[PDB]
Design a protein around this ligand. Structure first.
Ligand SMILES: COc1cc(CNC(=O)c2cc(Cn3ccn(C)c3=N)cc(-c3ccc(F)cc3C)c2)cc(OC)c1
Length: 303
């Protein structure tokens, strides 16, 4: 069992926080918010660094490039924006979605961006020019998450339509559709850090680990509450091998990845913990909550 303890509480956003992500170099934390702003924080001390402004409506998601020099953000204003973190400059504004943009990620080479939208499509963008390269008619309901695998050859997407799908990056072809017995909305998905599995959340209070090549669900993690919101989930690999997820009972849940037992719950937020992130080298967890709370909390552990 880990021993996560609250170290810092981060206030500054004036509306619901939508996403938190640690930079891959471990130095920074980025946060997005319905207040239309991105904020950067020191990852180890929680000290506020700067605000990045530009979107016209709330920001749903933010993600780092591999070298921690760029961010991409997805917004209700139907754009994505690519930011140079050091200068604060908006480098490109990606226009092409016909509805709110919900989720985004760079590929490992950080030469591409993938996005998912309420327009039920997944789009692939060129980082250097900012132009849309492919539009994939991915789903028949809003796209809840998009993520590249370890080498960037695949994209996984999830949707309220109940499907997880695996896409070939180069051709845009659907390679696999995954779904379990019930057809609950799929509210989050991502590849494992070694790229062999996908971790999928469904709006029936369930996280599932899938062998996607074999199309088999290996493990399930339960005990949290998730019936309404698209909540991030994470692999924690710096100490013990855990699963981390926020919850609609205002807690952060931590499971043992292999045995699936709950090993810790983290108490402190006053609203749905919509987003969590795991530091890439230290046993640090960032958690963020919705409109009744508006804060980000940083937790640290021995293992
Ligand atoms: C059919 O109706 C639906 C209803 C919902 C309900 N929305 C959410 O749950 C939700 C979840 C997150 C967390 N987040 C962000 C990216 N990723 C991958 C996440 N997991 C953020 C926000 C948000 C967006 C804009 C904003 F200004 C402020 C906030 C807090 C809303 C989702 C839906 O599918 C897309 C279809």
């Amino acid at each position: 069992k880990p021993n996560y303890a609250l170290k810092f509480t981060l206030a500054g956003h004036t509306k619901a926080v939508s996403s938190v992500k640690f930079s891959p170099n471990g130095e920074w934390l980025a946060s997005s918010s319905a207040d239309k702003l991105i904020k950067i924080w020191g990852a180890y001390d929680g000290k506020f660094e700067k605000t990045i402004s530009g979107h016209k409506l709330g920001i749903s998601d933010v993600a780092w490039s591999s070298d921690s020099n760029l961010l991409v953000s997805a917004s209700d204003d139907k754009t994505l924006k690519i930011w140079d973190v050091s200068s604060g400059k908006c480098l490109k504004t990606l226009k092409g979605h016909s509805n709110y943009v919900f989720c985004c990620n760079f590929n490992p080479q950080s030469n591409l961006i993938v996005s998912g939208s309420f327009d039920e499509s997944v789009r692939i963008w060129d980082v250097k020019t900012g132009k849309c390269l492919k539009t994939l008619p991915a789903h028949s309901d809003p796209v809840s998450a998009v993520h590249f695998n370890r080498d960037g050859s695949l994209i996984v997407s999830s949707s309220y339509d109940g499907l997880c799908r695996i896409w070939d990056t180069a051709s845009g072809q659907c390679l696999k559709t995954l779904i379990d017995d019930d057809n609950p909305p799929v509210s989050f998905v991502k590849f494992s850090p070694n790229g062999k599995y996908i971790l999928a959340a469904t709006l029936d209070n369930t996280l599932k680990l899938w062998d996607y090549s074999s199309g088999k669900c290996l493990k399930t993690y339960t005990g949290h509450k998730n019936e309404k919101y698209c909540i991030f989930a994470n692999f924690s690999v710096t100490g013990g091998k855990w699963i981390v997820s926020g919850s609609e009972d205002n807690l952060v849940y931590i499971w043992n990845l292999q045995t699936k037992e709950i090993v810790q719950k983290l108490q402190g937020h006053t609203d749905v913990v919509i987003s969590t992130a795991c530091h890439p080298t230290e046993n640090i967890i960032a958690s963020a909550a919705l409109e009744n709370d508006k804060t980000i909390k940083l937790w640290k552990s021995d293992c």
